[model samples]
Target: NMQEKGVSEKEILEELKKYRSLDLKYEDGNIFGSMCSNVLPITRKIVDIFLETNLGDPGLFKGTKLLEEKAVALLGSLLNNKDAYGHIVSGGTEANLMALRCIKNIWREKRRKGLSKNEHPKIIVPITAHFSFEKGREMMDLEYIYAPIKEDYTIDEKFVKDAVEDYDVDGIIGIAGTTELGTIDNIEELSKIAKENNIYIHVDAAFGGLVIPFLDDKYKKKGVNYKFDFSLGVDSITIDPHKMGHCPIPSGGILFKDIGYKRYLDVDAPYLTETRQATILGTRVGFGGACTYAVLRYLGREGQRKIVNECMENTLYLYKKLKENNFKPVIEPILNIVAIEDEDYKEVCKKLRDRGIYVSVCNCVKALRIVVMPHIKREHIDNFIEILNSIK
Candidate 1:
């Protein structure tokens, strides 16, 4: 039953604390599969300062709005497009959704002008795409042509080329860092195909956007094409600050090559301070923008490279530990994510969970996936391997 009277503040805090104790914390360092980790220390103060501010009414919260703009600019610069135009949405899902909406609208316009031959807007997406694109297809009624991956797990460029030519495809999605294997698709090849056909291309670099830009020459692999930014023919990108940018939750980013794409996503908002709004949410939190701006500004390129290098080092350490313990890695470590081969990955994951160690499994392959975020250290990797060896 609902309480008839309000509880005491001390009692409420006690109850909250009791429930919070059940949650996993990044400081403990057992979270091995999550893309997110502990955020920068400075974000806490920035969040507090902008807690009440609402970007939904940018006219009223002018300062917070400015932060959002600058944050987008910073993200654009990282993607090699300093003049890029976009927004800091909730996360990768919202960002990807916005990109799909823009593509759908443009496709509709083309169809209206008797330019497109397809009955509905068809998009070519990789089989290893994030679930957000599936949600977009369900919501927007867009047709998706699932492209198969090659032996190396990247999207097959030849398949994409044939599919677009066979069918009237309007857009293509290229993933910079796949969720399962952390393998980058051949975005450079896909961009070339999209450019030739005049199709819109969006790169889902939610995890690799920050890391790839700061990746050193030593950590990069030989066969992977790391170019997925606006420097290619890509029209838009979904890069999340919440994933690898060390920002707090719900701080995702979506950027277009330029401001010309805004017309597709804009809608008239007569009641709000801003006459028009382009984002999916009507009343969005302002702290996402503020926290992202503060984190990027505080950590320049050099500092970001240091953090990425540390994570990459830990990833290599985890790889070494796994090999020492006789765990077969599905592929070499790429961008701080490692995949270990295991036919019974689900049961293995369950066993690890039972032992109070957490990790995830891959959907495309029979392997256990581990994202070595900044929170993971050498000691934690050793402990994880010890427990995993025992379970095996």
Candidate 2:
């Protein structure tokens, strides 16, 4: 130990395996609550080359910058925005933060006419909204107001209407594929109110964005259901490639209706010769863009739709499995997330963990979250069902 010599490759590899084996991986049936799955081998290869490439310094990573632009355009097409703006950030957290920062900055720039000395800007969202919204509120120094979600778990637009009518509102948030509930708020309806009140609207579709677009175009014609992107008339939307897109983790993005909104989050740096820096991280990973591009190109739209449909089928299978076993599910999933209720939620989760099965308590609904990501299959579901039979 005192010699401080490097360990042998065998010893290092053995140690890595020893630790890695302790945590359950995305195998047949051991994990849930993670929005991760296997990606194309070529995507991994792209990621391998850019392990050290930094998007922060665009001057150096020319290929990364170009790929990022193309990747953004491709994602825009999927999100139904042909002319979307904004860059890929670390993930939805950073994406949400950037969205709020833009709304805050844009509000400041335009609010000069109605400047109040003690104005406390505010945004309204469903009580079931992601913690990232709270993080955004605190980071941007905005007021946090939550409205009760409807019985179906979607945000009540009535609450949004009431809040905007009562308060000096600056921003409004809508969730698509909310993390715990897997319910989409009525952003299309909410957007109308936001526009009337001159409030900037942000949609957090971190999980739903990828899945919803491919969910039967007939559903859109009816439009009685979910709407995640530009058609909702939102100023900005957060979409994560790490989720349903099945790209590598830490790959999240925000798309704006116009490039004008991006200037709000832009920070000038004298040291860097570029016009400005937009992301929260000054040195961002170039690998995410490459990985995202590879994933999109490899799958194409048809492939992506097929994957989502399979996951939905998987979700329904598990939903019935849980129901038959007397577990009360929160709602039919709008995306891959499935939540279930039990008297002793804590005990159920603990028992699952003991059996090498992974799940999490959904804070939004106070139930167990069983997300049906692509990695889940029949065997995994059967294993879970078998275990549930014993445990509960």
Candidate 3:
């Protein structure tokens, strides 16, 4: 109604002025703060880069094909894969779905060729794995067996092994950083187990994939002792450049250790002529390629490391402050996310909002979740902590 009826600019300005008068502090990227829309800036730049250069052209190296190859190469190197294959998907959901679909087909092909039908094909996932796994499983019709987590929130290796053994699993999913509690599963141990059983391992490092590589030895030491790349036995991985990769939103990636895995996703069409052999969707926008290249060129590895390190430092600072204030944090934050439980979390959040600070609240565990991205500064964190301490 406002857009169609045409409210005067002066009126809109005056209404916005009311917000300023209240001194409502909005955290730029915190999901709870209502400033989550700030993620658009980076994503828009990615789109602009693609449109300005005509980068989606299929016939020339200047567009889609070249951009795809370059993104694959860059991510391969960063993830420690010298000869990995990858594609930029629409987002993490698509990436995970595509990966699971491919793996399911491979397993089905094996069964058709002479594996036992009684040996049900299943995917082993941690209790804290993203909901995308469930979505993927629903779409693909694959059975799922969830592994239990330890007291510290990490996946228990024994539970994983038991699930794999009991289900005759075809694939396993290892989470680098969980969404619910921001925990990183043991990829090294999980990879080893998968390799021993000849089962495929897909590391859903959607959150940590971009940030973990740049983390210093201190934080890296806290994660599982394995680099997520082609060198590991992991068959595939889902990495989102939009989250920690500092790119625009809607950019997710799926990388395959073996080029042969592409065979499972191949589609044959007699009517339409397309150079690509297989994909979940055709004519995907080349925005992901352009954005990933732009960010890599702009930040390089050194710049990315600087950004990631700062985020880790901010997380540590927030974790310490929360602890000092007697907030019951789930675990010491390993990367950029921290979760804490407080009896008055909701009330405290409301009070903090009154004081011009914002933070995330987790309903599942009844706690507060905080993400310290690169854009956040020390003063912003200090102010947030001061207000948090003042509440209640």
Candidate 4:
């Protein structure tokens, strides 16, 4: 038998005041928080209009059809994808889960239709890939094989190819921006290998997909000039609007090159068919779709490019400062993330926190990760560098 806390509104407000005093807000430095662009006034107006017209309209309930269509068109064009198609999910993890699940089902069906199940479909991913792939493997009961990264923190292509060749590799998960080091793997080379070996290549670009497209020549010239769209021979990609895209939280997407691949994950139900189409999650909140549409419409191409460019510029600025201060950076800033290694990294992070500077710690390599999102400014980077230099 459990009982609710039953706190009064005044008490709740008091508790919130205490939290405010502690300044434990989200890391997104926006004044109104990062949800400003995500859930703009226009998005709210659209939702209101929809509710006023059709309170129970099933068409309106699936609010993302038009939005998804627009996103596909824009993102496809950006990725050089002539016929790319995609669907929106709650977040990056969901996007990765959906893509991996579909790939697993496709492999399972092929095996059922006379392939070999004794081999057991497996995915080859770098040790630096997101944990969502592992989550997908757990849910689909598929095997996941990890390949080691080189000293530079990029996936060792030789080791990856070896793993795939040794194990009957069904798919290879390549990362555009690794979580720990922010390093971009050799997507071009990986794509070539996957094509030759007849294995699916799923590119996890949750952190870089939105920024890489708009980076200036300075950063792009550093071998970060690749796209994971249809042109890259990539079977699928996971992009998170909630990340470097400057959209609201919990907004991620997955795009596929072939529509036939979606058939493996399709569900046919009479009730759902009559009311709404089957989805990864039934009865999803329409706010997310409205937010994504609003952000894309508000930002458009130029606005998005400007924000992405600012982020990249800030990353470059921070990278130069890190080098000037004699801090050993693991890799150059690939997109908007900068990671540095120090023997006393944890203590240094705590010292910086005492001065109101926040950063992320990477467990895989015991390094410091600083994300330069759209809202971060040049002053932020300068101040961070100043603090780092001041430390003995």
Candidate 5:
């Protein structure tokens, strides 16, 4: 209801607390499906400091803008490109959209110059791609060839190779750390294919970008390529600072190999301080950059690796618990996500929710999806298994 009378600050805060109390706490550790966990304490302070800043008008908030650049540079370093160019966007959806927009515009420019004969850009996306890719295709009037997944749930690289040779597609999309099963596509293979055909390749490492880089050699599954950054011939990448980067929400990232790709997405904004804007949103929050920079710098590589190692250790614990209880795992724990085979996954998920235990189910596989974020602990895993045993 729209209030006609103003309330006291204390009264409003009390009212907010009542509603907030209904939400689950990350510390309580029931939220298994989410990729995000409790953000770093430093990032929360960064948010408060930059509450009024807006990077949309960089000239006004010059310091915040530089922080954005530094954040991008730091993320670029993680992705193996010191000269990467991109912005701190809303999330993976916006990041993916920006990458798609850039590729589309580049293809359009080539077609205008008679360099590309294709009238419309065709992007070969894996069937396991996030729903955001579908949104991009619908809005941009782009053709997407959904490549089937292989036995291990990765994109069928052979299918991608054939499609590129036959259709002369303009782009290829690869996933590093898929949402449903946490399976990483063979991006290195896809990159080679893209490079061979002169096609643009974008890796959606929004989840894995933070996890994969810091993963220890022991935790890594044998034979998984795991090389999905710029070094693998990828043109652009979508990495979320809000996911594994321990930053607050609305802190997604999109980075290109270099500054040259920026031209394709730039739209002239004469009304604003900046003459040009590349992001999808005009008025963007500056805290995303501030928080991202603060968290990454605070954690560094060593700090991040420690967190990742703990999550992997917990992932294995959950997997072992599930197996002891006779629950079948769809695959071995890859990254920090686990999938338990269950024919009636939806009903089981609802039952668990009814009992106040939160988890998720996979769309492609009949299994329960659980992400071992930092908030989850050994005791939490034990508690979830006990509850799941009673319900399942």
Candidate 6:
């Protein structure tokens, strides 16, 4: 039954506190599996200030639209595409869906001329693709062709090459940072064949978009580089600010190398002034755009680079310590995720939770996972290791 009388603010506040305590304490650094962190606490204020600002209604949120476009343009620059077109969506899922929707639309526009209605349009991706691809396959009604992975845990390029030739593939995909192993797919190799076949290639750089560019610069690898940007001819790219940009949650971005790619996603409506909407959601939270802009201002390029560098340092420390302790890592981490090659990860994870240190297990690779977010310092990692050792 609905409460007949209103409760005091104190009672409600106490209730909220009680329930909130049941949630994961991410700030404590006990969280090792989440890509999120307490690094962008200041963005919370940005989100609150524009709490009611809706991107769908310009009459109420005129400035929010401008902020969204500006941030999208700037993020495009960060991804090495100055002339790119994009917008901030809900998260990686929405961004991925938008990319797939655009691909399907453009593919239909072309294929419909000569092809029949039931022609089996397919998207060829690595076996390690995020679940969003499967969701996209169901949502967009496309045949998902999953290629195999090599021993190094990266996508088997030859398998993907052969699959494209063998299957009725219309679109191609590569990952800059995969979910389970954090390994990067060969975007350049995939791009070469995609270009040759004139297939639209979309890259899921949800976590890698922020770190890979910085890591590449830090390493200064010039010739035969692992390019994961527009230069590699990626038609579209998904970059999640929530994952690595240290922005508050619900800040996922989809950038297109050309305006033509964006033209496919527009949906016309008679109610709105523009009468056209390209993004998946009509009424998105405008505050996410403001938060993204504010966080970028707070942590400029160098500051963001420093954060990733430090996280990598912690990751290396943990990796080396684990190796020395006779723990086998799934593969050398290309990003911050470290998956220990253990058969009984579920049992290992449960016992660690009993010690108040939370970790995760990779279902695909059958390993214990530790994602080194910005909040996880070298000391915190040591504590986790100490607990792990004590368990034995």
Off by over 4 Å in 5: 1-3, 114-117
List, residue by residue over 216-303, the lDDT tens digit for candidate 4: 6666754443655567778888877767655555567778886777676666545542253324765554445555666777887788
Q: Which candidate would rank higher by lDDT, 1 or 6?
A: 1
lDDT of each: 0.92, 0.81, 0.73, 0.69, 0.92, 0.83
Which residue ranges in model 1 land beyond 4 Å of their true spot? none
lDDT of 3 by residue, 1-392 (tens): 23558778999899999988765333443233221123425658568756543222355434566777788778888888877787877778888888888778878888889984635568887778777888877766878887888886778889888776776788888887777666777788889989898988898888878877787887755345436555676888888887777666557788888688888877764444444555576656677777776787778889888877887887788777777877777777776788878777787777776675677776456777777766676777777767676665
In angstroms, give how far residue 339 of model 4 lies from its true place.
0.9
In order of appearance, the predictions have TM-scores of: 0.98, 0.94, 0.83, 0.84, 0.98, 0.94
Model 2 superposed RMSD (Cα): 2.2
Please give, for residues 1-392, the per-residue lDDT of candidate 1 as tens digits: 89799999999999999999999998796798999999998998988988898888999999999999999998988888988999999999999999999999999999999988878889999999999999999999999999999888899999999998899888999999899888899889999999998999999999999889999999998877989898896999999999898998879999999999999999999999998899999898899998888888899999999999999999998898888888899888778999999988999999999998899999899999999999999988988999999998
lDDT of 5 by residue, 1-392 (tens): 99899999999999999999999998897798898899998887888999898888999999999999999999999899999999999999999999999889989989999988787889999888999999999999999888999889999999999998889688999999999888899998999998888889999999999999999999987888788999886999999999999888889999999999988999999999998999999898999998888888888899999999999999999999998999999998779999989889989999988877789888888988999999999999998999999985
Per-residue lDDT over 1-392 for candidate 2, one digit per residue giving the tens place of the 0 to 100 score: 46678889999899999998877678657888677766656767777888888888888879888988888888888877788887877999999888888777766865676663325567787788888888877766887787888788888888889888887787888888888867788888888998888889999888888888877552232334676678767898898888787777768988898777767888886677465988888888888888777788988888888988888888889998888888788876667778888777878999998998888887755688888888999789888889877887
Backbone atom clashes (below 3 Å) for every candidate:
0, 0, 3, 0, 0, 0
User: Which is superior by lDDT, 1 or 2?
Assistant: 1
Supply candidate 3's per-residue lDDT for 385.
69
Candidate 2 residue spans exceeding 4 A from truth: 1-3, 110-118, 217-224
lDDT of 6 at 18: 98
Ranking by TM-score: 1, 5, 6, 2, 4, 3
